[PDB]
Amino acid sequence: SVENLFDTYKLNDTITLKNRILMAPLTRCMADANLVPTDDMVAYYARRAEAGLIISEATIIRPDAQGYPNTPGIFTQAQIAGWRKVTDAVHANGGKIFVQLWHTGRVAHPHFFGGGDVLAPSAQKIEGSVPRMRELTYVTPKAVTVEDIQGLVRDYAKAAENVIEAGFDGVEIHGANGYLIDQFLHHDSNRRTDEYGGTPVNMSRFALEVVDAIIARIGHDRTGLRISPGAYFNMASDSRDRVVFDYLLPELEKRDLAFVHIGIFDDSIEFDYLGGTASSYVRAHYGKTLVGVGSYSAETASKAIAEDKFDLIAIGRPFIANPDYVAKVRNSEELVAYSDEMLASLI
Ligand SMILES: Cc1cc2c(cc1C)N(C[C@H](O)[C@H](O)[C@H](O)COP(=O)(O)O)c1[nH]c(=O)[nH]c(=O)c1N2
Ligand SMILES: CCCCCCCCCCCCCCCCCC
Numbered sequence: 001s002v003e004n005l006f007d008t009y010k011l012n013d014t015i016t017l018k019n020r021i022l023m024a025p026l027t028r029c030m031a032d033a034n035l036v037p038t039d040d041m042v043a044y045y046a047r048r049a050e051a052g053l054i055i056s057e058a059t060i061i062r063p064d065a066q067g068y069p070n071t072p073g074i075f076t077q078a079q080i081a082g083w084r085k086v087t088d089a090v091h092a093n094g095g096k097i098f099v100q101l102w103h104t105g106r107v108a109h110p111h112f113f114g115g116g117d118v119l120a121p122s123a124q125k126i127e128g129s130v131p132r133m134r135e136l137t138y139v140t141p142k143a144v145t146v147e148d149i150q151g152l153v154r155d156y157a158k159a160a161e162n163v164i165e166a167g168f169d170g171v172e173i174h175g176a177n178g179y180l181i182d183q184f185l186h187h188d189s190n191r192r193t194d195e196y197g198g199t200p201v202n203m204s205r206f207a208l209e210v211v212d213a214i215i216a217r218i219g220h221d222r223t224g225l226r227i228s229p230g231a232y233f234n235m236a237s238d239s240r241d242r243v244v245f246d247y248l249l250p251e252l253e254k255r256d257l258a259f260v261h262i263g264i265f266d267d268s269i270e271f272d273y274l275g276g277t278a279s280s281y282v283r284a285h286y287g288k289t290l291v292g293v294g295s296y297s298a299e300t301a302s303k304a305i306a307e308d309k310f311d312l313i314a315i316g317r318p319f320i321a322n323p324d325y326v327a328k329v330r331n332s333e334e335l336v337a338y339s340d341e342m343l344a345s346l347i
Contacts, residue, residue: 024316049095105180170222176263
């Protein structure tokens with residue numbers, strides 16, 4: 001029995017979720033040429049509104065954040081209007097939705113933004129090329145200056161303001177999966193020797209500045225953060241990364257965020273450097289609402305939550321394969337297994 005998945009969950013004084021099931025953020029690359037959410041996207045999100053909370057696909061804060069085709073933005077008025085259709089539809093269907101705010105850092109590609117500079121903490125290129133594209137090899141980033149950083153913080157904050165204009169319930173800051181914020185938090189990507197590198201406090205500085213700027217614009221109750229203490233996507237591991245997160249997590253707790261959310265694909269994986277699974281590491285160092293994710297069935301998620309491993313469960317691939325995931329779980333119906341083939345279709 002997975003009855004606990006359908007508990008009401010009070011995130012905070014502003015937001016109460018009707019159940020513990022979140023739709024995980026899932027890039028689909030289906031926005032229009034202007035990076036505006038389409039009416040097909042509106043329908044896609046609207047039909048998943050039985051989720052306690054939807055986290056949107058990663059949404060770029062400005063043009064030089066783009067690293068994949070057709071990923072929506074929220075920096076133009078047209079994008080705001082397109083997103084307003086999405087949020088209105090979700091709300092009309094009895095749901096709630098946060099936008100996931102994205103900058104890809106060294107994983108951006110200049111093909112998407114007129115040949116400009118790719119930005120990152122340090123000039124450390126990742127291997128390979130953009131997936132599902134013809135020969136877009138990743139490039140050596142420019143190490144951002146402190147002035148670049150100030151502009152990036154500003155643009156995260158402005159994006160957050162725009163999110164509220166677009167009618168979202170809040171923001172999940174994308175601090176995970178090897179993208180810009182995560183790049184500051186790991187030694188592979190952050191080789192800086194200024195106030196944004198070297199020490200745990202310094203490496204955490206960018207993440208905390210973005211969090212604080214966004215809170216100052218839209219409020220802590222409407223601000224969550226996704227993190228990846230375990231390196232796994234476009235990120236080489238480093239035994240020293242753990243102490244950065246040892247510092248970051250208590251600092252994050254001071255901000256009384258709506259939630260912290262793990263970024264991983266299979267949370268049953270144990271990380272040597274974390275002394276166990278990603279969620280268990282975070283749970284041991286962070287005492288507020290935690291969203292678990294990664295290869296959980298409704299059954300294993302229910303048990304984890306019962307055992308106080310985390311509080312909310314994000315579901316990704318099964319929500320792609322089953323738009324009616326929540327109803328099927330509620331009624332013990334057969335779930336279709338996800339296959340990569342399903343990404344071609346937006347249903
Ligand atoms: C096609 C696709 C696209 C995305 C993802 C995954 C997949 C499959 N994931 C990761 C996702 O949120 C989740 O962490 C994983 O899918 C693992 O959870 P499940 O096992 O699928 O429930 C992801 N994560 C994120 O923070 N922002 C994103 O935009 C995406 N994009
Ligand atoms: C990101 C959207 C969909 C991507 C499909 C490809 C898979 C990306 C995630 C990889 C998961 C396993 C990575 C290997 C980890 C090594 C270190 C633990």
